[PDB]
Amino acid sequence: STLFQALQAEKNADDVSVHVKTISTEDLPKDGVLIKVAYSGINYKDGLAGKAGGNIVREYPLILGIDAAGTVVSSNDPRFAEGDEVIATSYELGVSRDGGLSEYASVPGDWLVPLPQNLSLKEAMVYGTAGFTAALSVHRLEQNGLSPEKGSVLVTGATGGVGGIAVSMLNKRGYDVVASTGNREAADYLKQLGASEVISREDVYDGTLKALSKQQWQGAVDPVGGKQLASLLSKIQYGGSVAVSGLTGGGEVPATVYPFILRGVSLLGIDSVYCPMDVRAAVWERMSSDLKPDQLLTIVDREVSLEETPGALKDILQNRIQGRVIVKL
């Protein structure tokens, strides 16, 4: 039916390759809605998909992806019509099914999110999965008591994907943001995203940890897990909460029971991969209103092309990239 470029990862023995192959429309999962991808996605999980030892993908070959945002061309699904702008993120995409890093994508109607009126196709990808994860985290924390005045809100691993955006959204909602990173010299760019304060990894965790510490924060959007979350928990304000998104040193969390039962703190698991659609559609409205930051264009490091995509996959992973990479198809 029509030929185009895609970014296809594949295994020869023990080893993951990744190159822009040229592919026909008839080859795609037939059974989704046919999308022409406007924009992009380069995400940490895509990098892992692209590399042996990543533990994301299980049979190759597979077109890489996880995030895409384009226009419906061809529907068999009455819910969607030609011309509709949609976002196709999460679920199986980019993991066990053809993904977004490609002109054209077939994805199930039941994962399409109708593009919010006040985000363009490219703003939707400046956001992507990180970004959704961030917005998701402020939504969960908000339904557990968070409000801009119960005190100051902590973003760990700011600077990374999720953290960088959460900094900005919190800041558009009017919370006081404290961002922590290991990289000095990131202070300026975190402030421009909205942080009114910048602290170190070490200001959040040092020598191990106790059950309860002086109250410092109220809540945290937390993309980094491990011993450091354990710590932070004990510095969270009464009734406060924490939203976890990542591992980044520490699958283990040696936590106590104390911040929980004495200070009423909650820890909210956040997974964007299977979030159900209604909540998904609601978080996206938000990301285009309530939570749409004034920078935003500032969180983009580079807009690269489908061609230039193997190299940018090698660059997150080797974290040589501040902010976000969108791909323009």
- DSSP code at position 91: T
Residues 6 or more apart whose CB falls under 8 angstroms from that of 215 comprise 235, 236, 237, 238, 263
What angle, rounded to 10 degrees, do the helices at 161-173 and 129-142 form?
50
Does the protein bind a copy of itself through residue 273 (CB under 8 A)?
yes
| Residue numbers after which the chain breaks, C to N beyond 2.5 angstroms | none
268/326 with CB nearer a copy of itself? 268
Instruction: Please count the residues of this chain forming the interface with a copy of itself, following the rule CB under 8 A.
Output: 70
Nearer to a copy of itself, 102 or 266 (CB): 266
Smallest distance from the beta carbon of 262 to a copy of itself, in angstroms?
6
Q: Is residue 61 reached through a cis peptide bond, with omega within 30 degrees of 0 on the bond before it? A: yes
Binding marks (x or -) toward a copy of itself, 139..168, rule CB under 8 A?
-x--xx---xxxx-----------------
- Chain length of the chain: 329
Site for a copy of itself in 68-127 (CB under 8 A): 77-84, 91, 108-111, 114-118
Q: Which is nearer to a copy of itself, 100 or 225 (CB)?
A: 225
Concatenating the DSSP letter of every residue in 274-305 gives S--HHHHHHHHHHHTTTT--S-SGGGEEEEEE
User: Which of these segments, 7-15, 17-25, 231-239, 305-313, binds a copy of itself (CB under 8 A)?
Assistant: 231-239
Nearer to a copy of itself, 65 or 116 (CB): 116
Tokens 């200001």 belong to: 203
Written as six digits, the tokens of 312 are 């940018």
Q: How far from 134 is each of 73, 270, 294, CA to CA, in Å?
A: 30, 9, 16
Stretch that binds a copy of itself, among 47-55, 233-241, 299-307, 320-328 (CB under 8 A): 233-241
Segment 191-230, which members bind a copy of itself (CB under 8 A)? 211, 214-216, 225-226, 229
Nearer residue to a copy of itself within complex by CB, 11 or 150: 150
201 is in an annotated binding site: yes
Look up residue 312 and give its DSSP letter. Answer: H
Q: Rounded CA gap, 16 and 238, in Å? A: 48
| Distance in Å, CB of 219 to a copy of itself, minimum | 12
User: Distance between CA atoms of 133 and 148, rounded to whole angstroms?
Assistant: 19
Which residues participate in the annotated binding site for NADP(+)? 44, 159-162, 181-183, 201, 247, 261, 272, 319
Residues that bind a copy of itself (CB under 8 A): 31, 77-84, 91, 108-111, 114-118, 140, 143-144, 148-151, 174-175, 211, 214-216, 225-226, 229, 237-239, 244-247, 250-271, 273-278
Which residues participate in the annotated binding site? 44, 159-162, 181-183, 201, 247, 261, 272, 319
